[PDB]
Structure 1
Amino acid sequence: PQDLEFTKLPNGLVIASLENYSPVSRIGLFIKAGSRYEDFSNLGTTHLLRLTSSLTTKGASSFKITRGIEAVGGKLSVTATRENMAYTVECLRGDVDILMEFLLNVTTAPEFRRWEVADLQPQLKIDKAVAFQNPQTHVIENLHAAAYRNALANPLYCPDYRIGKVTSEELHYFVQNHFTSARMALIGLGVSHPVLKQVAEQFLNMRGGLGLSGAKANYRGGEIREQNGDSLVHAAFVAESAVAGSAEANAFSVLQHVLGAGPHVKRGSNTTSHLHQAVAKATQQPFDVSAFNASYSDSGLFGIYTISQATAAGDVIKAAYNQVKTIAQGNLSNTDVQAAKNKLKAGYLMSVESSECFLEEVGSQALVAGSYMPPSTVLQQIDSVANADIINAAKKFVSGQKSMAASGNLGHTPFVDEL
């Protein structure tokens, strides 16, 4: 009984709301500032910056923010990614004006008490360590470094040498240089739009338009081998791919879903997947291969990612690449394309379906576009894709130079250009 009301401001700040009737109101404030916006002079700054959300600001004590939000029973979270930094907060419907008063505060005039920041520096080791509890993060936030000369090469996590030396002044510099009102956008759910017209009015006095917006993130083909004692070597061939919002990006999407990039049935081999079957008869069961596609406004990435026994990796990644090469030959059945397009429809609907991921969706889309696109409109574009665009996509992935990353024993894994 309601659809979201997209809106802008004379200040240039995007705003939007989609009324629901769930008792938990859930508002989020997204900023274009991200990990790609650091240069060499400051790095890992955002990784601390999201940890600093609980710190005292000019308008409130940290004790007041913590004990207040907890007394409300609501909660705050700071999502972060290379393109965007997404603040978010959830509360009961009557509590909104309270928690939002914290929200904007945390992002309007933070006061980075230097001693509190120094107290939060050790926390960086803990967060960075638990984040790497999964090896794949260690592989990809490393693979990007292997793919890009410049902007996107910067890790989401602080480099170990910077853990003890990040300063509050760098935090201020990054804040007035990147929490620009033009970069920001605000989204609500349980909250109605018209009251957002006034509660968001508070920010208009804060911060003028236009930020810094440096860099371009050029591609590079270099490897990053690591060599560890781990038996299950990871690996990731990657080639540059056009994105975002291009139909060619849709071609790479359908391309990954032909290749079984997405999980489905539990406790069963992904028989429709070309890669799992290409590897299953290539090597014994202990493996897990899947396509990988990343979307960034400057440029994106596409390529297979593999987990395998160290002895078997050379057979596995080559089999998985040859499986792509067969599609690069134009040998592609009509049916699996339909099944893949269906996997994209059900998949995108699953992502949109949950309200929180829906908020991430509407917001992340609101920043890059400035025009909300309803999912059916996505479905016409995603149905629009032709087989030839897919074949050209695979030809592009094969023809291009390969970046690669590979944690593990690396006793048998071929170097990029050697396989």
Structure 2
Amino acid sequence: CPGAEDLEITKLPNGLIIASLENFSPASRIGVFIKAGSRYETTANLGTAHLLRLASPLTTKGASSFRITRGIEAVGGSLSVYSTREKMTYCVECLRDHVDTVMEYLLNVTTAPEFRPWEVTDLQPQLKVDKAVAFQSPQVGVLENLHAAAYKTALANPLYCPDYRIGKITSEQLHHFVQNNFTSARMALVGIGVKHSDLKQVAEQFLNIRSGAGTSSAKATYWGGEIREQNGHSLVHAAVVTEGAAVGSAEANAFSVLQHVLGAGPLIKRGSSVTSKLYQGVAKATTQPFDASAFNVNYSDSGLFGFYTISQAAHAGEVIRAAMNQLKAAAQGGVTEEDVTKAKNQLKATYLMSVETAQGLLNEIGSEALLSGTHTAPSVVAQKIDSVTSADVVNAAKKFVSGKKSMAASGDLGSTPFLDEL
């Protein structure tokens, strides 16, 4: 009766990664991590990555659009597609028994779509809907405009399909995108609550199609732009970033610590942030309610770092300038050796409880197994983080004040400062 098991990893001749782990949980969760996304779109096929993840329930070469939804729901299972600008995960959850059942539809969707022209055409207007509900949160507005103002290509491409290309994505563009990117050396069959010998058997004696590395991406050229949206909303969102560090970078951990030094989102419900020098530093400058956190993204070949301020209209200027000064003062040395250790503690915490969930665990395993075909022991990831000096943090702050900034802000920008005013 159940005990402590190890995580296993296998690399097929295909270049395919199989990262499994048995935890004896009554719920299995299998995913297919793929290096796809809008990062590989060009001006000719914009939005084909968005339509692609909406195209999951469409007919496949082995399962009808009917049987996919009906067969999965027949066993309480669920199918979902999460994707960023340069990653694509196809997940399935179900009871331990009906793994093989739901595994079929998962395999059919990712490795054998048909993209029937009439089904594709009928799906096109869902782009309008899915975008409209996601854009209800003002952050996705400036966050998409940020990448547009930060880069020139690849990462500059929007995560949600642009309006002008809705209904104008061909069924052939979906086929080409899957053929060029969903290749074996770019994917990983990652499972949880499954024996490795089974997950391995499935990946080879069922899963194949185009091998190799396929279409590559033009590495992200930096721009440094200033996109501003005037929409009269009483609240003004604003983001200011420079080039950060990539995934698996040396300066990667240094920025994450600087993030918690400045502070990233309250840890106490309805609570002020004391550890946050950013939250506090702005609070001294403005009177009214607001939010100001540290912003940090790490991509494969680049990254962004800075601050995001949700503030009132006329007090946007006060908050933004104050939030800027906090990174200036942080670069001028204003970082206690305890602040680092306190941030290195907050960070080691955040990481650990994030992997509590089934989503967090499968993602964390599959993320690394996809890029660097290994899983790092949680003790060593705890080593790599607190092996960051106090100087490394002040250095990361120095790079912000020095580097070329790119700003995205949407709201009533009547009192929102331009980028050449910071």
User: Shorter-chain TM-score category?
Assistant: over 0.9
Q: How does 1:15-414 map to 2 (within 5 A)?
A: 15-203=18-206, 205-414=208-417
One-letter amino acid of the counterpart of residue 63, structure 1? F
One-letter amino acid of the counterpart of residue 396, structure 2? A
1:312-361 CA-partner distances (Å, limit 9, x unpaired): 11111111110111111112212221111111010000111212111011
After TM superposition, the structure 1 stretch with the greater mean CA deviation from structure 2, 196-205 or 21-30, is: 196-205
Q: Report the alpha carbon displacement of residue 14 of structure 1 after superposing the two structures with TM.
A: 0.5
SS in 1 for 2:237: strand
One-letter amino acid of the counterpart of residue 392, structure 2? D
Q: Report the alpha carbon displacement of residue 203 of structure 1 after superposing the two structures with TM.
A: 4.1
One-letter amino acid of the counterpart of residue 22, structure 2? E
For 2:333 and 2:110, how far apart are their aligned partners in 1?
A: 51
One-letter amino acid of the counterpart of residue 402, structure 1? K
For 2:266 and 2:363, how far apart are their aligned partners in 1?
A: 21
Alignment CA distance shift 1:315-1:133 (3 Å): same
Q: Does 1:7 align with 2:13?
A: no
Q: Report the alpha carbon displacement of residue 372 of structure 1 after superposing the two structures with TM.
A: 1.1
One-letter amino acid of the counterpart of residue 114, structure 1? P
Kept in 1, the 8 Å contact 2:330–2:397? The answer is: yes
1:17-44 CA-partner distances (Å, limit 9, x unpaired): 1001111111111111111010111011
For 1:338 and 1:197, how far apart are their aligned partners in 2?
A: 42
Q: Report the alpha carbon displacement of residue 263 of structure 1 after superposing the two structures with TM.
A: 2.8
Kept in 1, the 8 Å contact 2:295–2:306? The answer is: yes
Alignment CA distance shift 1:217-1:203 (3 Å): farther
For 2:372 and 2:208, how far apart are their aligned partners in 1?
A: 25
Flag structure 2 segments of 5+ consecutive residues without an equivalent.
Answer: none
Kept in 2, the 8 Å contact 1:402–1:417? The answer is: no
For 1:195 and 1:246, how far apart are their aligned partners in 2?
A: 34
1:207-242 CA-partner distances (Å, limit 9, x unpaired): 222211131111111100111110110111101112
For 1:188 and 1:29, how far apart are their aligned partners in 2?
A: 9
For 2:266 and 2:377, how far apart are their aligned partners in 1?
A: 25
For 2:113 and 2:337, how far apart are their aligned partners in 1?
A: 56
Structure 1 segments of 4 or more deviating over 6 A? none
One-letter amino acid of the counterpart of residue 217, structure 1? A
For 1:174 and 1:205, how far apart are their aligned partners in 2?
A: 16
SS in 2 for 1:262: coil
Flag structure 1 segments of 5+ consecutive residues without an equivalent.
Answer: none
Kept in 2, the 8 Å contact 1:247–1:385? The answer is: no
One-letter amino acid of the counterpart of residue 20, structure 1? N
Kept in 1, the 8 Å contact 2:107–2:207? The answer is: no
One-letter amino acid of the counterpart of residue 202, structure 1? Q
Kept in 1, the 8 Å contact 2:285–2:318? The answer is: yes
For 2:391 and 2:126, how far apart are their aligned partners in 1?
A: 50
SS in 2 for 1:57: coil
SS in 1 for 2:355: helix
Kept in 1, the 8 Å contact 2:189–2:199? The answer is: no
SS in 1 for 2:230: coil
One-letter amino acid of the counterpart of residue 185, structure 1? A
For 1:194 and 1:18, how far apart are their aligned partners in 2?
A: 11
Kept in 2, the 8 Å contact 1:178–1:212? The answer is: yes
One-letter amino acid of the counterpart of residue 138, structure 1? G
After TM superposition, the structure 1 stretch with the greater mean CA deviation from structure 2, 90-99 or 286-295, is: 90-99
For 2:240 and 2:284, how far apart are their aligned partners in 1?
A: 21
One-letter amino acid of the counterpart of residue 318, structure 2? D
SS in 2 for 1:286: coil
For 1:165 and 1:113, how far apart are their aligned partners in 2?
A: 15
SS in 1 for 2:419: coil
Q: Percent identity over the alignment?
A: 74
Kept in 1, the 8 Å contact 2:142–2:410? The answer is: yes
For 1:263 and 1:286, how far apart are their aligned partners in 2?
A: 14
